[PDB]
Each structure stands twice: as C-alpha cells, then as structure tokens.
Amino acid sequence: ATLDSWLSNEATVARTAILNNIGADGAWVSGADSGIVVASPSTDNPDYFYTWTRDSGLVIKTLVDLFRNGDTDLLSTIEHYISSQAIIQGVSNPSGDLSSGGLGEPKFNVDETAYTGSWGRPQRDGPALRATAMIGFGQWLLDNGYTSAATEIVWPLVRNDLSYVAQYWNQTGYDLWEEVNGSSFFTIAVQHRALVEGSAFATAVGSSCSWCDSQAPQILCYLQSFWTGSYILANFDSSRSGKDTNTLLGSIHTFDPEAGCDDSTFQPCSPRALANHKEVVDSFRSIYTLNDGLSDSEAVAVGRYPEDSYYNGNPWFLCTLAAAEQLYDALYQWDKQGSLEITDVSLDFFKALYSGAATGTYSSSSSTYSSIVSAVKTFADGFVSIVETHAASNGSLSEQFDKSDGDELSARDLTWSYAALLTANNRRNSVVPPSWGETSASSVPGTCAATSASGTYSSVTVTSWPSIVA
C-alpha cells in the first residue's frame, strides 16, 4: 500500500534527479561538460563534484535499460555520454595516456580535465563498466538499423576499454570503495562480464576480440578463489573480515536473467550468493543502533563493510537497496526455472526466513516454494521500507543515513543512490536487463593461469551522430 506507492513516486524523482546531475543542462551541476555524470552536486564536505568512470558507467547502463524499455527521451543523454567518453579516453592523467594506462583513472574534473592530486588509482573496474554501458546502446543501434553508428563510433570506444581489461585484470589496484589496494571481487566479476559481452558485440559489428576470448575464461577461473567456503571474500590483501556489500553489487551488476543459479558466476540465486547475502547482512545487525530489536527474520539497514569508519561507518542507501535487489533477482530466477533448490551451503539463508527449511528441490506448485517465496519477498521489501523511512520528504537520497537516528549525511543527492533505486524497483517489478551471455560463459578451466593478452588502442573522434529516431 505504502511501499508500492512510495516506489512509483520515487522512480519519477530518481529519474529527474539523475538528469539534474548530468551536464551540460543538468540543473544541479552547472559547470559539468555535455554528457558528464557528476557523482553529487556537493562541492564541499564532502567534495563529490567530479565524474567517476564507475559512477557514470553504472548510471548510464541504468539509463540505457530504461531507454530500450521505452524511455525514448533519454536518447540525447546517452549520445552526449558516448561523445564525452571519446574525449575522456584520450585525456592524459596520472594513470597514463590512452595506450599506457590512462583508462584506469578513477575520476576526472567535470570540465573533462584530469584530476591531478593523489588518489587511490588506478581502479580497473571503470573500463569494464563503461564498456558494458556502451555495448547495451550499441546493441540497440544494430537492432534499429543504425549499423554505422554502432560500428564506427561505439565499437572503437569499447575496443579501447576491453583491451585495457584484458591487459591488466591480473594486477592489483583500488577497490570500488577507493581504499583497499589489492584484488577485489566486484572488479573481477564486472571485468569477466565485460569481456564476454565485448566478444559477442565485436562479432556482431563484423570484427573480433581475440583478447576478450583468451582472457574471459581466465578471469572466471580466478574469480573462484574469492569463495571462502562461507562467503565471498571482498578483497585479497586486506586485514578486514572481508564481508562487504561489494560482493552483493558484484552479483546484481552481473545478473543474467537467462542464467540458472550458477555458483561459478555468483548469480543472485546461486547457493554461494545466498549464503554470502546472509553473512554480509548479518554483519550489520548489532553495530547500528538503528537495527536494535530487529530479529534475524527481518530486514536491517546495511552499510558497506562492518569495519567502516567513513563518517563513523553508517548504512548507505545503495547498499541497503542492493540487499533487496539481489532477492528480487533470485525470485525472478526461481519463477522462470519453476523450482527452488535448498543446499547445505544455502540452508542458513533459508532457515532464518522459513524455519521449516530442509535441503531438497521445491517445484513452484509446492507448498514449501510458496512459503519461501513469500517470506523472501517480504524480507526484500523490508529493505526498501528502511529506505523509504529515511529518504527526505521530497524524495531526496543522500549517500548515507545515520547509524543511530537515520538522518541523511555525507554527499547529498548522490547519483548512484538514485540509479540504485531505479534498478531495485525495476527488478521488484520483473523488469530485467538484457542477457550478457552468461550461459556460454560459466565453465571454469581446469587450471588457472596468471596471464594477460594485449589488445589494441586507437583514439576515437566523434564527428557527428546520425539523426537517430526512437
């Protein structure tokens, strides 16, 4: 009643707020160039008035999906983004130049100039995310007869990012939270996905990605090492416990609606992703006063990692939403399959929600299935109610919400917060993203090798966009 309604409304605010944070007509970000996604309009305490390759990549993939589903008015936004990326790719920065590491640079100034101070660089997820966002649009272009745009503009840009992923996946860098210098799950997971989908896209435009092909199975191989036997290790080279919403994000951003409950790829309904979900969420239950009194069967406010001290370490809107989004994704998957399986690995996850849980297979007409899917949906929705509870009255969503009183804190109107609302809502409604080919890319090689493949680098110039109609 309350929730369903709040969401319809929030989805509208979320779409507007996002556009307000994109140049060069964005109402909140005067100064940002055309196609530049600003993290937040907050210029002071904290200063988030920059454009991050990850943030923009995530937001744009979200907008691309809205567009393909009928939000035709987002066309110019997407086109501006792509054109801005042709320029950014060639900007010389502390990470290097186009062909010498430049692509791994985390953030840039909104005016498209390099950010030259000290930063946790490089961040190798960036290029994989940007490539995923473009491939989605490039697919639309091929399907609607704009073959030339797809082949001469998108492909060349994706080609750069994919060469980067193939070349450096096997090197340390900073995590998505920009603090741990090592090897991180999220990064590895989104890289694997980009290579696979880059390869298919390349073939579709009449070309190839030999380096996509040789490296994908190796990244997948390596990805298996993050499973500890209990949960997904967020990063190697860390002294933390390793329980981090990074791993939830990793699953949801690599969710393929055609995939079964594959452990190799950590799908939302995979026993490993389910076991992981409980361990990560449970880590926040006793550290936030806001969670005081809630039982193990109830949704709680979720932060990044239990050890977080950032602004004292508080719940984040996007983290809380990720916790719900994974569940909506699993429900979808179970429904499509027509069954749900409970294993020894996922028993704790299920039992906390449905105390009569026992291992076995449960068809969709079975009493147990109905019992579990209801409890799961209720649980997922509870995460969303927490968000509704703490959002501003006009719908404004901040980065964080206070661990004790739930007031909004840290960067205001965070673009990533709004994109996270949209995808969770979509998933809640059975609106899923296009497949990335997970079904021909979940086989793990017998032996993992520490390797790379060098692709090719070439600067792209976007002279003009054909007069596309949608």
Ligand X SMILES: *[C@H]1O[C@H](CO)[C@@H](O)[C@H](O)[C@@H]1O
Ligand Y SMILES: *[C@@H]1O[C@H](CO)[C@@H](O[C@@H]2O[C@H](CO)[C@@H](O[C@@H]3O[C@H](CO)[C@@H](O)[C@H](O[C@H]4O[C@H](CO)[C@@H](O)[C@H](O)[C@@H]4O[C@H]4O[C@H](CO)[C@@H](O)[C@H](O)[C@@H]4O)[C@@H]3O)[C@H](O)[C@H]2NC(C)=O)[C@H](O)[C@H]1NC(C)=O
Ligand Z SMILES: *[C@@H]1O[C@H](CO)[C@@H](O[C@@H]2O[C@H](CO)[C@@H](O[C@@H]3O[C@H](CO[C@H]4O[C@H](CO[C@H]5O[C@H](CO)[C@@H](O)[C@H](O)[C@@H]5O)[C@@H](O)[C@H](O[C@H]5O[C@H](CO)[C@@H](O)[C@H](O)[C@@H]5O)[C@@H]4O)[C@@H](O)[C@H](O[C@H]4O[C@H](CO)[C@@H](O)[C@H](O)[C@@H]4O[C@H]4O[C@H](CO)[C@@H](O)[C@H](O)[C@@H]4O)[C@@H]3O)[C@H](O)[C@H]2NC(C)=O)[C@H](O)[C@H]1NC(C)=O
Q: Which is nearer to ligand Z, 29 or 221 (CB)?
A: 29
448 binds ligand Y (CB under 6 A): yes
Q: Per residue in 18-57, is it b (16+ CB within 10 Å) or e — as a string?
A: bbbbbbeebebbeebbbbbbbbbbbeeeeebbbbbbbbbb
- Which residues on neighbouring strands pair with residue 199, listed in sequence order? none
Residue 22, classed as helix, strand or coil, is strand
13 binds, among ligand X, ligand Z, ligand Y, none (CB under 5 to 8 A by kind): ligand Z
Among 53, 62, 170, 417, binds ligand Y (CB under 6 A): 170
The residue among 113 and 459 lying less far from ligand Z, judged by its C-beta, is: 113
Which of ligand X, ligand Y, ligand Z, none does residue 43 bind to, with CB < 5 to 8 Å depending on kind?
Answer: ligand Z
Closest distance to ligand Z from the beta carbon of 308 (Å): 17
Contact 269, 333 (CB under 8 A): yes
Cα distances (angstroms) measured from residue 223 to each of 31, 211, 231, 237:
40, 18, 13, 15
61, 48 Cβ separation under 8 angstroms: no
- Nearest distance, CB of residue 166 and ligand X, angstroms: 8
Q: How far is the CB of 36 from ligand Z (least distance, A)?
A: 11
Query: Which residue of the set 33, 175, 263, 438 is catalytic?
Result: 175
Could you tell me the smallest distance in angstroms from the CB atom of residue 466 to ligand X?
11
Instruction: Please name the helix (run of DSSP H) or strand (run of DSSP E) that holds residue 184, with its range, or none.
Output: strand 181-184
Residue 392 contact, options ligand Z, ligand X, ligand Y, none, Cβ 5-8 Å cut-off depending on partner type: ligand Z
Q: Is 119 annotated as a binding residue?
A: yes
Say how many C-beta atoms besides its own lie within 10 A of residue 83's C-beta.
20
Q: Which of the residues 97, 112, 152, 178 is marked catalytic?
A: 178
> Do the Cβ atoms of 271 and 343 come closer than 8 Å?
yes
Cα distance between residue 254 and residue 276, in whole Å: 15
Instruction: Tell me 50's DSSP state.
Output: S
Active site residue 175: yes
Name which of 228 and 458 has its Cβ closer to ligand X: 458
Helices 210-223 and 155-168, axial angle in degrees (round to 10) = 40
The residue (of 101 and 313) whose beta carbon lies closer to ligand Z is: 313
CA distance 80 to 51: 14
Is 237 a binding residue for ligand Y by CB under 6 A? The answer is yes
408 binds, among ligand Z, ligand Y, ligand X, none (CB under 5 to 8 A by kind): ligand Z
Task: Name which of 431 and 448 has its Cβ closer to ligand Y.
Answer: 448
Residue 120's φ and ψ, nearest 5 degrees, are -80, 90
| 42 touches ligand Z (CB under 6 A) | yes
35-43, 69-77, 228-236, 285-293 -> range binding ligand Z (CB under 6 A): 35-43
User: Is 9 a binder of ligand Z (CB under 6 A)?
Assistant: no
Which one among 89, 123, 183, 343 touches ligand Y, defined by CB under 6 A? 183
Residue nearest to ligand Z (CB): 42
Pick the binder of ligand Z from 25, 31, 97, 99 (CB under 6 A): 31
Torsion angle, alpha carbons of 256, 257, 259, 265, to 10: 30
Contact assessment for residue 51 and residue 110, using Cβ atoms and an 8 Å cutoff? yes
- CA–CA separation, 454 and 458 (whole Å): 13
Question: Nearest approach, Cβ of 100 to ligand X (angstroms)?
Answer: 8
Q: Alpha-carbon distance 379 to 399, whole Å?
A: 23
Side by side, which strands form the sheet with 181-184? 173-174, 181-184, 235-236
CA 234 to chain centre: 15
* Matching residue, tokens 């944070």: 21
418 sits near ligand Z (criterion: CB under 6 A): no
The window from 40-48, 173-181, 190-198, 325-333 that contacts ligand Z (CB under 6 A) reads 40-48
**Two structure tokens written together for 345:** 């690995």
Considering the rule CB under 6 A, would residue 406 count as an interface residue with ligand Z?
no
> Contact positions toward ligand Y, by CB under 6 A?
170-172, 183, 221-222, 225, 228, 233, 236-238, 448, 450
> Contact positions toward ligand Z, by CB under 6 A?
13, 17, 28-31, 41-43, 45, 49, 392, 394-396, 408-413
Q: Which residues are annotated as a binding site for substrate?
A: 119
Active site residue ranges: 175, 178
